[PDB]
Design a protein. Structure first.
Ligand code: BOG
Ligand code: BOG
Ligand code: ISC
Ligand code: ISC
Lengths: 207, 207
């Protein structure tokens, strides 16, 4: 009862297909965190292999640049086997959710965390919710957030909104996210570019 | 430089045009708060009069039922004349924002707050952000939230998401909200019904 629908293959958007950004922010490595959002085996299994492959190749490219440039890396991941109390109203849309087993909860090996990277717990749509993401960013002097991962219109977008709300400038990497469908993905970008982030492609980040 | 686009008249959705709810929550007055979200003069002036009139008539109907049934009423409102620091990244999409003058910041008279109603400050998209909404709901023993107001896809939706995330069951009143366009409004409902709320009409609440 995952609540996650059948996902049909679609192309990741190119720079030419992105909506116009209304903001004018510019990414500075020294100010930034890369949020690798919910790239757990359980959340990537629903993706068709072509989409999975495109997503993980770009996120990996992105992560390597970030490490080379001194961008702080952060992963969010659900603990798995949430208690009823922990699960709360996620139950109603998404069932009991993934198990606390390596097969479900592991970050996929192509994005394997390194010793210096932050490991944050995901409870709800926003990566900041009941995590110490905000506190860590403040204590690290980092006020920009680069987002990649899944699902574009759900946790990725809501995390973007929350960062924005905390006066943290977000950069949503349009082809290093994936979603339930092309339309969901496109609408997440449209929302971001006009309401809370700079929408960019992986190449655009790498310059 | 409000950032608010020209809004063209459109009909509020009827029960038959609503997306299917995936949740099964049921509103109990004793558990609930009615959030009258950003119904300030400044935010309603961009609406064409037909849309304004439909919105305020349904919100008023809703508020009267809520009072008759013992539902706690709460208003959110921006202080106006935000400092640069207070305004933060809202500046980039929405300019300096409304003034701290009655002409901008007042709740519209058709929804005039009463002495028992909560007055909460709005800073960002989510009504909970830097307000004491959550704290008050917890201390009042209320764990359901009925939302009306503007703009459907921005603060109304993000507030709905935040309530949901705090295991507070939301009820989004589809024809007691308004938005930048019909498509924005419809997509907010689609999002809500499948991700964070029961979507209902004013009549459906009044039974
Ligand atoms: C910016 C993001 C915009 C998303 C607009 C609608 C998002 C919710 O879309 C929902 O997806 C479900 C499949 O998961 C469908 O079954 C629902 O009918 C549909 O409304
Ligand atoms: C669930 C809510 C879905 C909204 C999908 C897109 C929302 C943002 O829509 C934006 O509205 C602007 C006018 O304000 C347009 O100028 C932008 O081009 C458009 O992308
Ligand atoms: C990958 C996300 O997880 C959520 C979305 C679908 C299923 C979930 C679950 O089973 O818990 C999440 O709540 C995200 O927030 O985008
Ligand atoms: C009515 C809202 O205010 C926001 C939306 C547009 C302009 C705003 C402003 O000028 O501050 C808000 O940030 C809402 O969150 O939906």
């Amino acid at each position: 009862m995952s609540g996650i629908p059948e996902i049909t293959a679609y192309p990741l958007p190119t720079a030419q297909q992105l909506p116009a950004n209304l903001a004018r922010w510019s990414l500075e490595p020294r100010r930034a965190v890369l949020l690798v959002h919910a790239m757990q085996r359980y959340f990537l299994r629903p993706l068709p292999e072509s989409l999975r492959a495109g997503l993980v190749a770009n996120a990996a490219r992105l992560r390597r640049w970030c490490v080379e440039q001194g961008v702080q890396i952060a992963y969010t991941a659900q603990p798995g086997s949430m208690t009823e109390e922990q699960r709360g109203l996620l139950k109603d849309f998404w069932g009991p959710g993934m198990r606390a087993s390596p097969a479900d909860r592991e970050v996929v090996e192509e994005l394997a965390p390194g010793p210096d990277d932050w490991l944050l717990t995901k409870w709800r749509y926003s990566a900041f919710f009941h995590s110490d993401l905000l506190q860590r960013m403040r204590a690290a002097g980092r006020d920009q957030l680069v987002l990649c991962g899944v699902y574009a219109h759900v946790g990725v977008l809501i995390s973007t909104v929350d960062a924005y709300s905390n006066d943290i400038q977000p950069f949503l990497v349009a082809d290093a996210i994936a979603d339930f469908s092309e339309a969901h993905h496109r609408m997440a970008l449209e929302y971001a570019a006009s309401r809370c982030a700079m929408v960019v492609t992986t190449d655009e980040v790498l310059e």
